[PDB]
Amino acid sequence: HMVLTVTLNPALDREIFIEDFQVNRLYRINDLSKTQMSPGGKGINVSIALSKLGVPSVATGFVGGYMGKILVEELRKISKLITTNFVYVEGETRENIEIIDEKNKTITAINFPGPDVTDMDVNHFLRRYKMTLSKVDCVVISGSIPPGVNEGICNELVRLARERGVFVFVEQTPRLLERIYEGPEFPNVVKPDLRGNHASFLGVDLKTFDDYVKLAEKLAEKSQVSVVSYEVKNDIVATREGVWLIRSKEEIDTSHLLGAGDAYVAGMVYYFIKHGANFLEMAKFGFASALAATRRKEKYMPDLEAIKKEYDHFTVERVK
Amino acid sequence: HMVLTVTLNPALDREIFIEDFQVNRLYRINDLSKTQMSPGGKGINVSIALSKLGVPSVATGFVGGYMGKILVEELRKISKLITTNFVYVEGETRENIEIIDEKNKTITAINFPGPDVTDMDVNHFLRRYKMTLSKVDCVVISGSIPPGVNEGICNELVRLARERGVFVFVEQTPRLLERIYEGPEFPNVVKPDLRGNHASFLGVDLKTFDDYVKLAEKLAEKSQVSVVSYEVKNDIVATREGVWLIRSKEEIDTSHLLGAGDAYVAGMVYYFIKHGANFLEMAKFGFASALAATRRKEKYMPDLEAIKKEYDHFTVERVK
Ligand SMILES: [Mg+2]
Ligand SMILES: [Mg+2]
């Protein structure tokens, strides 16, 4: 059983933990927190998450320069369950800085652009993407898209994947999803990234609960399952059969959220592989996994133990 | 003439320029000109500074890991005038982060501690330090110590230099300078780093102009010249002939301050090398460079043209 992840714009994450972080002060970090940098980007975090649950993946995307070397060398060190298969480009993989304040519950994030990618790079990627598709049972396409690349590319990735009988998971922003839902093929599972969204989506402006439901329903028309976030700690789940709402029983630590959403997707993938296409339970195991991730301030991908213990910390209501 | 700079705790400085920087928000730096990355650490910046003025130096200290490699290579690209002679350690050279908000005049700075250095590493360093001293006419020892290094090392470094008739400049925090002013030999030129200081220093609690003057005088008992900062944009210069006060004629931009103090020291080193040991004029030229360094938001080590331009913008008063 094998998974392919696509991370077209990966990052080296630099997580810095400062309580009571404020503008205009010098902070001396304590002698034991060393200058460190971890592999990141959504698909790559999904790979890490899957490796923690014992599930192998091929991780692909674009990587470049010296930062690139670091990402690749570090990613390989995490587990032999992850085989790296990136397309190498000129220019550096982006560093991203996340300043996490566990006392005041804030994340201050600074994101850098990513490399300028070209048509030959995208060509090579498409060749290799097609090769790997033959070896895998499902694909996770998620995250941002680097400068240079046509925004229609994920449509081609979804299209190639579905035409080949490969089950597709997609987590992207509305602007990018609008582009996937044009094309003739569609994700099996879609989880929109609504972080900091103020934009309309599929001709739905998202103010009331009925709007979010109606958005989940629109996606459930062409995809088999939509998981749509609502008031930070809840997810609306829509399939052909009906609509559910998964709710955390407690408030979540908003500063602990880095990569929780990627633990969500990894869970859904894990469930799919181990137990098949029972969509609601997939969504649930993903939610349990996202919650476990929020129990630590770091970008933390939970293990099976940690995920299972979250099963008593949420409820599921049937909406329709 | 040829200078040795010692930077036991080098850094890569990542400068990020964000107008209206506030906490708990995501920033996307699209413009590649709103970030800057460069070799840093006080002695390394002095080497860069001296290079702009045509004075060569050997730069020594500890470097390590991925960040270490970047530092050395970047440093070598800055000028043929800088020779590196660093002991390579296991562990990462620190990357510090400075966020500069030019609109609201703010620097939010995050300083990482640096790698653990072992006792074998420190010995290899001392052994190379001794060798370089016969090749040089003066030495600059500035900035912090990395973890695992005894705070007495700075005393040994001054002592070794001084026994061999090498002229010594030091810029370090009180705690480290206390350790230097123990030992049998003393710096020729001392410029204490008082940033963020709350402790008493040589028996003086720094709360009034007279305290800062008493401190300059105590240091001037054992060193030929002391340069002590007062209210951000002034410096008390004490020699055996008396005490002066150099003041900026105008308010400086406190957000443009990164690395200004190393420009100060570099100017003094240059003046010493070129026009001899006239101390007040050394401090004045140092002050000019410091001012020049502040004229840009980026870490900028000035050239001679930019330094001379500042002779207009400060006064000297005689205190005693
Ligand atoms: Mg977490
Ligand atoms: Mg500056």
- Residue by residue, DSSP assigns B87-115 as EEESSPPEEEEEEEETTTTEEEEEE----
Structure token digits, residue A100: 């996490």
CB–CB of B314/B249 below 8 Å?
Answer: yes
The CATH number given to whatever domain includes residue A295 is 3.40.1190.20
- CA distances B302 to A170, B243, B295, B298, Å, are 51, 27, 9, 11
Structure-solving method: X-ray
| B30 vs A: CB within 8 A | yes
Q: Which residue among B113, B148, B172 closes a domain?
A: B113
CB–CB of B262/B270 below 8 Å?
Answer: no
> Of the candidates B264, B251, B250, which has an alpha carbon nearest to the alpha carbon of residue B293?
B264
Q: Is A283 helix (H, G, I), strand (E, B) or coil?
A: helix
Structure token digits, residue A154: 């994920």
Are both B104 and B52 inside the same structural domain?
Answer: no
Report which secondary-structure segment, H or E, holds B132. helix B119-133
- Identify how many contiguous H helices and E strands chain A contains and give both numbers: 9, 16
CB–CB of A82/A10 below 8 Å?
Answer: no
Are both A142 and A231 inside the same structural domain?
Answer: yes
CA distance A84 to A73: 10
| B21 vs A: CB within 8 A | yes
The CATH number given to whatever domain includes residue B22 is 2.20.150.10
CA distance B256 to B166: 33
Q: Is A19 exposed, middle or buried (0-12, 13-18, 19+ CB in 10 A)?
A: exposed
Task: Compute the CA torsion angle A250, A255, A259, A265 (nearest 10 deg).
Answer: 20
Q: Considering only residues 215 to 274 of chain B, which have any Cβ-Cβ distance to chain A shorter than 8 Å?
A: none
Structure token digits, residue B107: 């620097």
Q: Is A135 exposed, middle or buried (0-12, 13-18, 19+ CB in 10 A)?
A: exposed
The greatest distance separating any two alpha carbons of chain B, rounded to the nearest whole angstrom, comes to 55
> Of the candidates A233, A255, A252, A294, which has an alpha carbon nearest to the alpha carbon of residue A20?
A255
Nearest ligand for residue A15 CA: 1
Bridge partners, B16 (sequence order): B35, B99
Q: Is A280 helix (H, G, I), strand (E, B) or coil?
A: helix
Are both B139 and B19 inside the same structural domain?
Answer: no
| Chain A residues close to B93, C-beta within 8 Å | 35
Structure token digits, residue B38: 């460069």
Are both A36 and A156 inside the same structural domain?
Answer: no
> B163 is in which domain, residue-wise?
3-9+42-92+114-320
Nearest ligand for residue B261 CA: 2
Are both A179 and A272 inside the same structural domain?
Answer: yes
Q: Is B94 helix (H, G, I), strand (E, B) or coil?
A: strand
Please give the angle made by the CA atoms of B303, B304 and B307, to the nearest 5 degrees.
Answer: 90
Resolution as reported, in Å: 2.5
What would you report as the CA-atom Rg of chain A, rounded to the nearest whole angstrom? 19
CA distance A299 to B4: 42
> Of the candidates B106, B111, B85, B139, which has an alpha carbon nearest to the alpha carbon of residue B11?
B111
- Identify how many contiguous H helices and E strands chain B contains and give both numbers: 9, 15
Structure token digits, residue B137: 């006419």
Cross-chain residue pair A36–B92, CB shorter than 8 Å = yes
Report which secondary-structure segment, H or E, holds B26. strand B26-28
| Chain A residues close to B25, C-beta within 8 Å | 108-109
Cross-chain residue pair B113–A21, CB shorter than 8 Å = no
Residue of B nearest to A26 (CA): B109
How many distinct structural domains can be found in chain B?
2
CB–CB of B239/B145 below 8 Å?
Answer: no
CB–CB of B13/B41 below 8 Å?
Answer: no
Q: How far is the CA of B248 from the centre of ligand 1 (A)?
A: 48
Bridge partners, A56 (sequence order): none
CA distance B293 to B254: 11
> Of the candidates A35, A14, A68, which has an alpha carbon nearest to the alpha carbon of residue B92?
A35
| A70 vs B: CB within 8 A | yes
Q: Is B161 helix (H, G, I), strand (E, B) or coil?
A: helix
Bridge partners, A100 (sequence order): A17, A107
Q: Which residue among A82, A113, A144 closes a domain?
A: A113
CA distance A297 to A303: 16
Are both B32 and B123 inside the same structural domain?
Answer: no
CB–CB of B69/B92 below 8 Å?
Answer: no
Q: Is A95 helix (H, G, I), strand (E, B) or coil?
A: strand
Nearest by CB: B27 against A27, A104, A109: A109
| B71 vs A: CB within 8 A | no
Q: Which residue among A69, A84, A113 closes a domain?
A: A113
Terminal CA-CA length for chain B? 34
> Of the candidates A68, A83, A76, A79, which has an alpha carbon nearest to the alpha carbon of residue A5?
A83
CA distance A179 to B275: 69
> Of the candidates A294, A284, A307, which has an alpha carbon nearest to the alpha carbon of residue A225?
A284
Site of tokens 């420009």: B263
Report which secondary-structure segment, H or E, holds B229. strand B225-230
Mutating which of A13, A15, A34, A106 best tests the B interface, going by the most B Cβ atoms within 10 A? A34
| B37 vs A: CB within 8 A | no
CA distance A6 to A187: 14
A293 assigned to a ligand binding site = yes
Are both A167 and A305 inside the same structural domain?
Answer: yes
Q: Is B22 exposed, middle or buried (0-12, 13-18, 19+ CB in 10 A)?
A: middle
Residue of A nearest to B27 (CA): A110
Q: Is B292 exposed, middle or buried (0-12, 13-18, 19+ CB in 10 A)?
A: buried
CA distance B194 to B179: 15
Listed residues: CB within 5 A of ion ligand 2:
B 256, 296, 300
CA distance A220 to A261: 20
CA distance B215 to A117: 58
Helix axes A260-275, A42-52, angle to 10 degrees: 50
Question: What distance lies between CA B21 and its chain's CA centroid?
Answer: 27
Bridge partners, B86 (sequence order): B61
Residue of B nearest to A98 (CA): B26
Are both A135 and A32 inside the same structural domain?
Answer: no
How would you write A124-171 as a 3-class SS string?
HHHHHHHHHHCCCCEEEEECCCCCCCCCCHHHHHHHHHHHCCCEEEEE
CA distance B41 to B51: 15
Are both A29 and A170 inside the same structural domain?
Answer: no
Are both A68 and A103 inside the same structural domain?
Answer: no
Task: Compute the CA torsion angle A246, A247, A253, A255 (nearest 10 deg).
Answer: 40
CA distance B87 to A292: 43
CA distance A78 to chain B (A): 18
Are both A158 and A118 inside the same structural domain?
Answer: yes
Can you say whether residue A196 is alpha, beta or left, with left for phi > 0 and alpha for psi between -120 and 50 degrees?
left
| B97 vs A: CB within 8 A | yes
Cross-chain residue pair B27–A70, CB shorter than 8 Å = no
Q: Is A272 exposed, middle or buried (0-12, 13-18, 19+ CB in 10 A)?
A: buried
Bridge partners, B178 (sequence order): none
Bridge partners, A13 (sequence order): A38, A96
Report which secondary-structure segment, H or E, holds B157. helix B153-163
CA distance B57 to B80: 10
> Of the candidates B110, B23, B11, B111, which has an alpha carbon nearest to the alpha carbon of residue B61?
B11
A251 backbone dihedrals φ, ψ, rounded to 5°? -65, 145
CA distance A101 to B22: 13
Q: Which residues of B254-277 are buried (b: 16+ CB within 10 A; e: fewer)?
A: ebbbbbbbbbbbbbbbbbbbeeee
Q: Is B315 exposed, middle or buried (0-12, 13-18, 19+ CB in 10 A)?
A: exposed
Are both B133 and B197 inside the same structural domain?
Answer: yes
CB–CB of B294/B256 below 8 Å?
Answer: yes
Can you say whether residue B231 is alpha, beta or left, with left for phi > 0 and alpha for psi between -120 and 50 degrees?
left
Please give the angle made by the CA atoms of B283, B287 and B289, to the nearest 5 degrees.
Answer: 120
Nearest by CB: A25 against B26, B29, B108: B108
CA quadruple A146, A149, A151, A152: dihedral positive or negative? negative
CA distance A271 to chain B (A): 32
Fill in the amino acid letter for B290.
A
> Of the candidates B202, B169, B174, which has an alpha carbon nearest to the alpha carbon of residue B187?
B169
